């Protein structure tokens, strides 16, 4: 048994329809390997300033005969600084027709995120702490764990196919892998973190130069661009011809000529030999103003986001603590087998 779920290419992130409650209230929520909690926008939520947080569906707990209030406060803050707060609850969650009962979720009543988020990472990365660092509620079975426990999938694992930059939709498959959608063989890479879905990136090849790395990179579906440590990003930037711009008090972004030559590729080599080749088109991010961001940015965190992941077929295995990777093959052909 596998469960395929369509991913809507929404621009900065990828979202899916998921229903919640006895009355199956449909939500459109970001599919996020970079977080571990599923939360929905309450119908009576107050959105953050200038945020249209209710336009992708909302959840009315009082409409669901099966909703259970856990009474514990929920709070989460994401890498980009956006936040959500509400209360923990449990309800039935249905994903492409497959229902799991008593699934712990957060009913969010204030958020600066545009829509709900289905976090599908490790349970150890659940946002169960107050903003004092104190744990306020126990770690729990998140959606992938519950799919496994309730016999919907065999292994806590899922395959990610974001599809092409111009594609309308991709696919995530819980408990399965589509063998038609990559070239060569999947190569298993060791997850190197207790909390994050990170693997060892050995080197990056850009403009025919090799740049040795060797540290972990988070493979995050819920991050738009690619982020490297400042020093490493600067080496790549110099080669790429990107220029650093302070855009705010404590934020620096690389920009690049909108007309830069994007005919080449950037190659990512991983510890166990996985190899992903990314077209350089992925490193010119159109802003609205006739300026372009470079697709690589400096950060204390190393994150390979959507502009990388579109070019890989990835099988995340949270039981084995491996992520198996091969060069994507864009095709509607399908040959899915259970994992």
């Amino acid at each position: 048994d596998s469960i395929s779920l369509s991913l809507i290419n929404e621009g900065p992130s990828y979202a899916s329809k998921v229903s919640v409650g006895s009355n199956k209230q449909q939500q459109t929520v970001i599919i996020d390997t970079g977080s571990s909690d599923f939360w929905v926008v309450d119908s009576n939520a107050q959105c953050g300033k200038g945020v249209d947080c209710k336009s992708s569906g909302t959840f009315t707990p009082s409409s669901s005969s099966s909703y259970k209030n856990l009474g514990a406060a929920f709070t989460i803050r994401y890498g980009d600084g956006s936040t959500s707060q509400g209360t923990w609850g449990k309800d039935t969650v249905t994903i492409n027709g497959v229902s799991i009962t008593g699934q712990q979720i957060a009913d969010v009543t204030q958020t600066s995120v545009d829509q709900g988020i289905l976090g599908i990472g490790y349970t150890s990365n659940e946002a169960v702490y107050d903003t004092s660092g104190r744990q306020t509620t126990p770690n729990y079975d998140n959606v992938p764990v519950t799919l496994k426990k309730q016999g919907k999938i065999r292994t806590n694992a899922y395959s990610l196919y974001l599809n092409s930059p111009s594609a309308e939709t991709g696919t995530i498959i819980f408990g399965g892998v589509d063998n038609a959608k990559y070239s060569g063989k999947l190569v298993a890479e060791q997850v190197t973190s207790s909390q994050a879905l990170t693997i060892s990136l050995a080197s990056v090849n850009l403009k025919g130069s090799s740049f040795s790395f060797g540290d972990g990179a988070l493979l995050d579906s819920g991050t738009t661009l690619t982020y490297f440590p400042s020093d490493f990003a600067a080496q790549l930037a110099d080669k790429a011809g990107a220029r650093l711009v302070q855009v705010a008090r404590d934020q620096y972004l690389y920009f690049i000529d909108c007309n830069t030559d994007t005919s080449g590729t950037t190659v990512f080599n991983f510890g166990n030999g996985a190899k992903i080749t990314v077209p350089n088109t992925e490193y010119v991010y159109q802003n609205g103003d006739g300026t372009c961001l470079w697709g690589i940015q400096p950060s204390d965190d190393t994150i390979l986001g959507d502009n990388f992941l579109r070019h890989a077929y990835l099988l995340y295995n949270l039981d084995a603590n491996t992520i198996s990777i091969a060069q994507v093959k864009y095709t509607t052909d399908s040959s899915i087998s259970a994992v």
Binding site: P12, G34, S35, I117, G119, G121, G305
Partner: peptide
């Protein structure tokens, strides 16, 4: 863009 829990 966004960067999703670090």
């Amino acid at each position: 863009x966004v960067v999703x829990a670090x």
